[PDB]
Amino acid sequence: TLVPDLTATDLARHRWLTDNSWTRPTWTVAELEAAKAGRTISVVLPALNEEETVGGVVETIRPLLGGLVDELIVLDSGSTDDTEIRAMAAGARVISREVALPEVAPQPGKGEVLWRSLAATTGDIIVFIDSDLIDPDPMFVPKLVGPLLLSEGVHLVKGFYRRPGGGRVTELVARPLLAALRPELTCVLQPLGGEYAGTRELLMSVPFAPGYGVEIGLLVDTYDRLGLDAIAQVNLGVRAHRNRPLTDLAAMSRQVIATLFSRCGVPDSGVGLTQFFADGDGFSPRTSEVSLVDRPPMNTLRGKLAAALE
């Protein structure tokens, strides 16, 4: 809706950029573990055919297990390569989508994986880390849980990277649409980032958007329910953006739009994106589908599950 009271200049100097944004986090693992105060921490790595990188990501996190980190799980998304055994050989516990929630048949896409991981974990804090990262840094998890353990009233922490400019979908799609529909959320540098942490109570009580909608849906639902102050962001360091083909990004953009529209009361047509390429006197069409149906809050399945929710 129309917000004539707010300007981009206002947003450029928002107090949130000072109080809830850490460009140089200096927390130590020891003071984070001392601040757990009985809360447990689960780290979840979604993985669809990431045999080349999953072990490297796991090993950056494995030394924390039994100290800061209580559970280290790779949620296997139906991989056909060697993802599972390499994750196990690197020290992670691996759980398939079926084992995570056997009563419900798996759907494709990343949101399904993160949603199912709620039923597979027990931590009061859940940290999500992508398993395709080529150069993961071992301070990812400590930085992501810092604001949850050492600030007040934070329930969602987004990890951003400094650019040595950035992601095309982030800068052209997600952030301009957030300026139009949820302008305070443009304070978040990288709303589509895959490295973030949330408290279980929050995550059990929001729907999970399907496919690549999941990050932006969680950000907007958190903002709508709890306000900007409940969100924080932390600099995870320098990561160069790797190249993805424009055609993949366009299908992903379509789903980001559908998920944002469904959270913001915008009636999305539900129609997938067609992409055309030259042929002769006609085109070579390429289509993708979009989903407008969330997985409901995991709390709604409570008491119906053979493995009980924590």
286 binds ligand UPG (CB under 6 A): no
Q: Which does 150 bind (CB under 5 to 8 A by kind): a copy of itself, Mg ion, Cl ion, none?
A: none
Query: How many residues sit close enough to ligand UPG to count as binding (CB under 6 A)?
Result: 18
Binds ligand UPG (CB under 6 A): choice among 41, 47, 64, 87: 47
178 binds Cl ion (CB under 5 A): no
CB of 112 to Cl ion, least distance (A): 7
- CA 38 to chain centroid, in Å, comes to 25
9 binds a copy of itself (CB under 8 A): yes
170 binds Cl ion (CB under 5 A): yes
- Rounded Cα gap, residues 22 and 160, in angstroms: 10
136 binds ligand UPG (CB under 6 A): no
Q: From the CB of residue 160, how many other CB atoms can be counted at a distance below 10 Å?
A: 23
55 binds ligand UPG (CB under 6 A): no
Q: Is 212 annotated as a binding residue?
A: yes
C-alpha distance from residue 273 to each of 172, 253, 257, 285, 286 (Å): 17, 9, 11, 10, 8
Query: With 0-12 CB in 10 A as exposed, 13-18 as middle and 19+ as buried, what is 108?
Result: middle
User: How many Cα atoms sit within 13 Å of 82 on the Cβ side?
Assistant: 8
- Please tell me what DSSP assigns to residue 197: E
Q: Is 196 annotated as a binding residue?
A: no
**Residue of 224, 242, 252, 223 whose CA lies nearest to 111:** 252
Is the Cβ–Cβ distance between 47 and 83 less than 8 Å?
A: yes
Residues that bind ligand UPG (CB under 6 A): 46-48, 50, 77, 108-110, 113, 130-132, 192, 194, 212, 215-216, 244
Residues that bind a copy of itself (CB under 8 A): 1-4, 6-9, 11-13, 17-18, 23-24, 162-163, 165-166, 168-169, 171-173, 175-177, 179-181, 183, 186-187, 189, 246-247, 249-250, 253-254, 257-258, 261, 266-278, 280-283, 285-290
Q: Which residues are annotated as a binding site for (R)-malate?
A: 167, 169-170, 244
